[PDB]
């Protein structure tokens, strides 16, 4: 038997796990290598100029970027199986005597005497809430936020770079 | 300004009426001071202008 | 012996604080406000000697 | 004119309605004090500031 | 500017340790089919020679 | 303007990569005088659900001479006694 | 009453000091050096005890000069 | 680490000999003492860590 | 039963982390911090208690138009014939200021008539030496003199004259009664006193409080200073009188309070009091009237332990130790320790020292694989 | 007559208790050490011994710390932690490996 006081603390607590849902806030866009649109990256293309430094790069920065992605994927899907796992696992703590392994039956009291609202940069607060262990799976996930395409730096940039004249020599 | 209107402001600032009243009065001076300032260059540089 | 050994005051002591309305009860003054709160008799004498603080 | 007079006066206006010397903003405090304690200047006092 | 502000930034990397694991395999055990004692009478029996065992 | 390394690294929107779409790099964001922690000792130990930061503060560095004379006063009287005592010895 | 004086301590020793009205009330009509320090001093004070970053920054760039 | 073995101890492994003669120390009533039986502790007969960084089965006995 | 409530208690939010902004509380209230009313309804009584310092005229003219609205059936004034006759004399004078400059004059009230006998000779000498020592300890200035009746109960005694209440005077600070108290505590010694008064201060604490109490004091000036007087600072000044002299700080301040709320409840003519005395002495009367009143404020009892989240506790230790089993089961390891968030109190960093919560009696402990990843089903639930 | 229990972790395994026996502990050393400063002041768990600023007294984290080492016959280290609250006091007594 569950009371309404246990049963509103499990709700509250339960709260505690829920996932950011990160993918409206990234770009979740794979680069395609320089080869699918210039045939002179291509290999089997006709007129093929061997570089071992410029494919070299642009191959590192197009995996670089796909392994980006790929590990944020894998991330938040390790978050949500975290989050649904500690939501769904048991809680035997409740079950114990109140004021020794459970908060009494009157529940949280504070006997302060504030006169003045607190500050919202209470350092302590903001960081119990910031860096928590069971969120480290998206914490440390690199992503390209979702921004307003700018057309000199998205559009114009990429054109003028791909339109680079190339020697056989 | 839209980020302050939505969340508030952090807080308050804690200071003293002296610090408040001097720091007014600098502000005061610094403005006659910058009037002084050019008026004076004007003058020196009426010819060349 | 093999058991960690604690005091028969130790483990009462324990017992009574696994109550859930325990509080300290050797103070001069009721500053927790326990309505069941008695002033413990006052250990100084006529002399007064020990007053000062 | 840009006359002396009439110019501090509007200068005094302009930083104090700048908004940057809100009362709202500050809380008043002793400042010289070892713990924060507020202003503990006299009530004509307060209100002559 | 708006949209960079509307949405949370990229983090930044942290060097905390979260939940550390043993960079090794598990801790041998007490008893088992392989023990630290097993580990322990090895250092006694030790050779580098030329020729295969 | 930040206090905490935490705080300054959650949310940077300031970094190279958001500043190079206006190319516009002024020498009052340098990096080096970003951030700057407080000059009182505090270090982090663990609370009731994650780290919590506690302020070591020992003494004050705002005292005056009216003040360390006052506290001084007893010594010199002091010191007066012992030597007058010494010199009636 | 020696406390009186000893003990007591005037109110301008423990209260941060006000600007002197009397240097700036009455000043020479020339750029010079004295009104140069003057302007400079009076923003590096404002620098050091003002929360108001905008006039800050502005306050930097005029003390450069 | 393992409890007090009332006169019925054997060390699980082969520990070092830290000394040919007992040390006569004066133990406080009720504080919890980790005597150490690996032998390499560097804190005297207490247990110093000692024994989680040698390949010994021999774990501090907490008394 | 004994009514053993807070009584001179200076320490103000003492569970709050206050600095910066956020402070501990406001002393600063004209009014409040020396106005108080109460009621015993057994006898239909109606008490108006003013702690006055005697250097407010704000607070000198709200007394004397609180007098005069109330009209009470009696008013009790913490004061002597001889000053009563001095203040008369005074006439045409409005002002605190004003009045200050007769301190002198007014001092003439402490007469502490006593013979020349040797006893009474070696006593004036002890304890004129002494005051003078705890004068200097006190280091008031002129503008601020607590003991010194002035302005305040001057308006309430006219007041009362005019409108023909009876006045009854307790005396100044050092009466009849405190003087052969004194003289009865033989404790008492210009050097001691100079010594335990440079030995008090025995914390930063007090130290801190101390000098933050007398460097407002000299910035606001004496008006300023008993205008913004708190409760708080009231206790924090009798506690340091107790500090600089525990016997003498028993009969000037425990007795006196005493033998005032003795006078004001058992000899007091009309049902509606006001009464005058210094503020330091409100707290022991209001609390004895309350006590005999049972007329305290109804307070809730606070478990010592009621503010500790042992729920959020219990629950970061479990979800800790479920990340832990979750980590081992994928890594096909063990956790390298059992500290949920790594702390440099213990050197485990750099030292062969461990956190590990392993621990059993036999090899057929149920309790064997407890903190272990094998203590988990490949779920990530307990077994 | 109470046999002890069997199990070592006692204090780790019923905070309510360590947390009661700390504010006790505490309360009393407080109440004997500036008796004009705690007497009329209840303690709990979220009180702090620091000044109004954030200052802490040394000799009364001392004094805290002698009376919690005498209570749990453990050795607190001064030199790496000092018990400025409540809180603190707990989570040293907790990090402690052998608190009785
Ligand atoms: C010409 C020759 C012809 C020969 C022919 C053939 C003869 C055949 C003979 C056959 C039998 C021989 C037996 C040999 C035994 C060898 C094996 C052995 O002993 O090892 C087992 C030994 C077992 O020890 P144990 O018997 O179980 O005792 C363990 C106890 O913990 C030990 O602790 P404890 O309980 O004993 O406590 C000691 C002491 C602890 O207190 C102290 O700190 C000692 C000093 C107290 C003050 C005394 C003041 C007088 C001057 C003292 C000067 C030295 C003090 C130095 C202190 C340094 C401190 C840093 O207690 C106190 O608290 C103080 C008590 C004081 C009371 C005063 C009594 C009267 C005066 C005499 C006092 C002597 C005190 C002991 C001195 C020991 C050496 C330092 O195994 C080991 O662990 C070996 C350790 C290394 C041993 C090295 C030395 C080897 C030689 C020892 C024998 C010496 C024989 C010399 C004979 C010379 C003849 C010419
Ligand atoms: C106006 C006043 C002016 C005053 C001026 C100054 C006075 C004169 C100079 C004094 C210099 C003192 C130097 C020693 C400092 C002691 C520090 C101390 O108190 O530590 C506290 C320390 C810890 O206190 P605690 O934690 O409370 O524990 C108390 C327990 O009772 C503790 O009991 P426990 O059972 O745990 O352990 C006690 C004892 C128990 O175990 C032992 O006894 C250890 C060694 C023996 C083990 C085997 C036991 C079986 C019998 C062995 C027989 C060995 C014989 C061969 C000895 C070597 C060859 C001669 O073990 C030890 O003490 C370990 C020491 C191992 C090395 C011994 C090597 C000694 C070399 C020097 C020999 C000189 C012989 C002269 C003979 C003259 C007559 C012919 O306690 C002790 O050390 C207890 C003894 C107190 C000191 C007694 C000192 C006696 C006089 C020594 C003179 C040394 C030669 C002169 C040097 C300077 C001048 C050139
Ligand atoms: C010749 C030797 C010279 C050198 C040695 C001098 C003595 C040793 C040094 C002493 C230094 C420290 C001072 C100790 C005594 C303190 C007394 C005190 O404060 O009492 C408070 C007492 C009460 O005052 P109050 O409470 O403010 O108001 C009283 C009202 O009148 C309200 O009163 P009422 O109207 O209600 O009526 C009562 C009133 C009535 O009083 C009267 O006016 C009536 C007058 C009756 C006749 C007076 C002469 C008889 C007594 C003479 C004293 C004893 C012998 C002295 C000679 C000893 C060597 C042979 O009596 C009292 O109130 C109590 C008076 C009892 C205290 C004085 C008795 C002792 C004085 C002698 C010094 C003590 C140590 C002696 C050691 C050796 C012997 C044991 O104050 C006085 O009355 C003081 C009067 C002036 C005293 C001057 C010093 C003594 C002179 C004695 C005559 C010596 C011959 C003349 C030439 C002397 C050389 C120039
Ligand atoms: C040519 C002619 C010129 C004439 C010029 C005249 C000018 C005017 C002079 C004005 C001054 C004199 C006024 C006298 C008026 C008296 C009126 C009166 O009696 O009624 C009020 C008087 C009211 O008394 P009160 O003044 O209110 O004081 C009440 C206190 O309870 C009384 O107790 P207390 O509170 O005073 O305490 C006493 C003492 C209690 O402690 C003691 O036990 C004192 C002794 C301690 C040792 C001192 C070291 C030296 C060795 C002393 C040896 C003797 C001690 C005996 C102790 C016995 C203990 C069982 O206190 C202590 O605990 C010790 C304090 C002492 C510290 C050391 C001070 C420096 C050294 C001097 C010490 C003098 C102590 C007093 C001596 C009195 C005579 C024995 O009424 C009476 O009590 C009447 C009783 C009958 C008394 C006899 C009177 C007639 C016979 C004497 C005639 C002498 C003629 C000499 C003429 C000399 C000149 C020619
Ligand atoms: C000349 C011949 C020889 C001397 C003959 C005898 C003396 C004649 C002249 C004096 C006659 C009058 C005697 C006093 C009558 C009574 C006066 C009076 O009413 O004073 C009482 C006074 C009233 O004042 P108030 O109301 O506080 O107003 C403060 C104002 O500042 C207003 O302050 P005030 O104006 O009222 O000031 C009062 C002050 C008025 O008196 C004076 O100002 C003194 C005048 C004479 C001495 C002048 C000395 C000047 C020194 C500098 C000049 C150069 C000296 C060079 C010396 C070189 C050789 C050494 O009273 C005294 O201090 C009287 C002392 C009399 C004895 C004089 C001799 C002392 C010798 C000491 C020697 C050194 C120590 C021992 C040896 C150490 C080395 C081994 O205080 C009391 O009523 C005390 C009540 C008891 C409880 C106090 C608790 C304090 C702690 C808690 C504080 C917080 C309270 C709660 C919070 C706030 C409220 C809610
Ligand atoms: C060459 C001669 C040099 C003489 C220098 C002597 C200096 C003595 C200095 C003593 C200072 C004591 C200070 C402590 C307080 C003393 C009491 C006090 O406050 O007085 C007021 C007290 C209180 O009296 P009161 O109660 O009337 O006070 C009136 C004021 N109201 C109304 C406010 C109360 O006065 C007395 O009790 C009497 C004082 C005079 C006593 C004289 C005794 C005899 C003295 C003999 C000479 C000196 C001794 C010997 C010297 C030898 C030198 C070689
Ligand atoms: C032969 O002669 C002798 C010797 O040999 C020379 C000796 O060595 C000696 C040895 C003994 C000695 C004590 C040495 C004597 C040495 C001496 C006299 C020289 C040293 C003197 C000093 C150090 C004192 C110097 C200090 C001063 C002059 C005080 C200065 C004070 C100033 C400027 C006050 C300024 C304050 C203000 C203007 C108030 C401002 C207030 C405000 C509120 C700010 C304004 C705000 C607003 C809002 C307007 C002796 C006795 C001797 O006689
Ligand atoms: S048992 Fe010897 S070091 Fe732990």
């Known amino acids: 038997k569950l009371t309404a006081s246990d049963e509103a603390y499990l709700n509250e607590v339960r709260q505690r796990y829920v996932t950011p849902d990160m993918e409206k806030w990234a770009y979740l866009d794979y680069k395609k290598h320089p080869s699918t649109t210039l045939s002179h990256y291509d290999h089997k293309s006709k007129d093929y100029v061997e570089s071992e430094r410029d494919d070299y790069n642009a191959d590192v920065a197009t995996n670089s970027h796909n392994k980006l992605i790929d590990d944020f994927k894998r991330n938040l899907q390790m978050q949500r199986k975290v989050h649904d796992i500690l939501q769904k696992m048991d809680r035997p703590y409740l079950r114990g005597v109140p004021g020794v392994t459970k908060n009494i039956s009157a529940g949280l009291q504070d006997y302060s005497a504030p006169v003045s609202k607190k500050s919202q940069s209470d350092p302590n607060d903001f960081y119990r809430d910031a860096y928590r262990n069971e969120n480290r799976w998206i914490d440390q996930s690199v992503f390209t936020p979702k921004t307003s395409k700018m057309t000199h730096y998205d559009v114009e940039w990429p054109k003028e770079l791909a339109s680079r004249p190339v020697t056989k020599k | 300004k839209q980020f302050e209107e939505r969340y508030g402001r952090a807080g308050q600032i804690n200071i003293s009426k002296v610090t408040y009243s001097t720091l007014i009065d600098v502000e005061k001076a610094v403005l006659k001071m910058d009037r002084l300032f050019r008026k004076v260059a004007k003058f020196e540089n009426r010819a060349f202008i | 012996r093999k058991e960690l050994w604690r005091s028969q005051d130790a483990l009462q002591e324990e017992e009574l604080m696994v109550n859930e309305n325990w509080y300290p009860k050797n103070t001069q003054y009721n500053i927790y406000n326990q309505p069941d709160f008695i002033k413990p008799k006052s250990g100084s004498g006529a002399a007064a000697d020990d007053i000062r603080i | 004119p ?41 009530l004509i006092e307060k209100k002559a500031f | 500017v708006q949209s960079q502000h509307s949405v949370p930034a990229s983090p930044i990397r942290n060097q905390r340790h979260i939940n550390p694991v043993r960079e090794s395999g598990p801790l041998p055990s007490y008893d088992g089919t392989y023990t630290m004692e097993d580990i322990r009478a090895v250092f006694y029996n030790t050779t580098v020679g030329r020729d295969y065992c | 303007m930040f206090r905490w390394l935490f705080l300054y690294w959650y949310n940077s929107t300031d970094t190279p990569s958001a500043i190079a779409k206006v190319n516009l790099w002024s020498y009052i964001n340098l990096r080096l005088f970003k951030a700057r922690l407080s000059s009182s000792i505090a270090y982090y130990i663990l609370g009731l659900n994650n780290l919590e930061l506690k302020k070591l503060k020992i003494f004050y560095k705002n005292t005056y001479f009216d003040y360390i004379y006052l506290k001084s006063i007893p010594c010199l009287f002091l010191i007066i006694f012992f030597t007058n005592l010494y010199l009636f010895l | 009453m020696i406390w009186k004086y000893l003990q007591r301590t005037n109110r301008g020793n423990i209260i941060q000091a006000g600007l002197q009205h009397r240097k700036f009330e009455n000043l020479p009509f020339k750029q010079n050096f004295d009104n140069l320090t003057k302007a400079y001093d009076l923003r590096m004070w404002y620098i050091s005890n003002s929360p108001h970053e905008a006039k800050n920054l502005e306050y930097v760039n005029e003390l450069e000069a | 680490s393992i409890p007090y073995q009332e006169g019925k101890y054997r060390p699980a492994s082969i520990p070092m000999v830290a000394g040919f003669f007992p040390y006569n120390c004066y133990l406080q009533q009720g504080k919890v003492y980790s005597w150490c039986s690996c032998g390499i502790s560097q804190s005297g007969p207490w247990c110093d860590g000692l024994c989680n960084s040698v390949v010994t089965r021999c774990r501090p006995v907490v008394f | 039963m ?3 409530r807070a009584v001179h208690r200076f320490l103000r939010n003492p569970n709050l982390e206050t600095g910066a902004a956020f402070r501990a ?173 440079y030995r008090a201060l025995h914390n930063s604490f007090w130290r801190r409080e101390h000098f ?24 924090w000044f009798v506690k340091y009188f ?66 500790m989240d042992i729920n959020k506790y219990m629950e970061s230790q479990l979800v800790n130790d479920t990340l832990r089993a979750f980590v081992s089961k994928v890594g096909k390891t063990e956790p390298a320790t059992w500290k949920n968030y790594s702390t440099i109190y213990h050197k485990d960093n750099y030292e062969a020292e461990r956190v590990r919560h392993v621990a059993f009696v036999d090899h057929k402990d149920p309790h064997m694989y407890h903190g272990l990843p094998q203590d988990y089903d490949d779920n990530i639930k307990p077994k | 007559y109470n046999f002890p229990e069997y199990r070592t972790g006692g204090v780790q395994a019923n905070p309510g208790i360590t947390a009661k026996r700390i504010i006790k502990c505490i309360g009393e050393r407080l109440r004997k050490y500036d008796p004009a400063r705690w007497e009329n002041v209840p303690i709990t768990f979220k009180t702090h011994f620091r000044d109004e600023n954030g200052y802490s007294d040394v000799a009364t984290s001392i004094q805290i710390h002698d009376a919690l080492e005498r209570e749990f016959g453990i050795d607190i280290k001064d030199r790496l932690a000092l018990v400025t609250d409540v809180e603190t006091a707990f989570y040293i007594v907790m990090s402690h490996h052998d608190p009785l």
């Open chain 4, 2 to 42: 840009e006359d002396e007079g009439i110019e501090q006066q509007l200068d005094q206006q302009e930083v104090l309605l700048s908004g940057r010397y809100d009362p709202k903003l500050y809380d008043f405090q002793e400042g010289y004090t070892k713990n924060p304690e507020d202003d503990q200047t006299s």
């Open chain 9, 2 to 4: 004994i009514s053993a």
């Open chain 9, 25 to 197: 509380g406001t002393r600063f209230d004209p009014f409040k911090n020396t106005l108080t009313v109460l009621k015993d309804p057994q006898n239909g009584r109606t008490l108006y208690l003013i702690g006055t310092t005697n250097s407010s005229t704000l607070l000198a003219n709200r007394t004397k138009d609180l007098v005069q609205k109330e009209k009470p059936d009696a008013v009790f004034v913490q004061t002597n014939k001889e000053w009563w006759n001095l203040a008369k004399n005074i006439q045409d004078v409005k002002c605190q200021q004003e009045l200050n400059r007769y301190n002198d004059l007014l001092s003439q009230a402490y007469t502490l008539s006593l013979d020349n006998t040797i006893r009474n000779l070696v006593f004036k000498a002890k304890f004129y030496s002494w005051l003078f020592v705890i004068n200097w300890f006190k280091a008031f200035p002129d503008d601020f003199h607590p003991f010194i009746p002035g302005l305040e109960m001057k308006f309430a005694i006219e007041e009362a004259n005019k409108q023909n209440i009876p006045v009854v005077l307790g005396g100044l600070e050092v009466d009849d009664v405190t003087l052969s108290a004194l003289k009865v505590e033989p404790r008492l010694d210009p050097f001691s006193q100079l010594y335990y008064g």
């Open chain 9, 212 to 235: 933050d109490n007398y460097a407002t004091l000299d910035v606001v000036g004496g008006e300023a200073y008993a205008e913004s007087m708190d409760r708080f600072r009231t206790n």
């Open chain 9, 242 to 307: 107790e500090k600089l002299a525990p016997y003498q700080k028993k009969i000037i301040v425990d007795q006196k309070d005493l033998d005032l709320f003795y006078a004001l409840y058992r000899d007091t003519p009309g049902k509606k009091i006001v009464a005058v005395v210094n503020q330091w002495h409100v707290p022991g009367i209001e609390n004895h009237w309350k006590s005999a009143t049972n007329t305290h404020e109804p307070l809730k009892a606070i478990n010592p332990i009621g503010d």
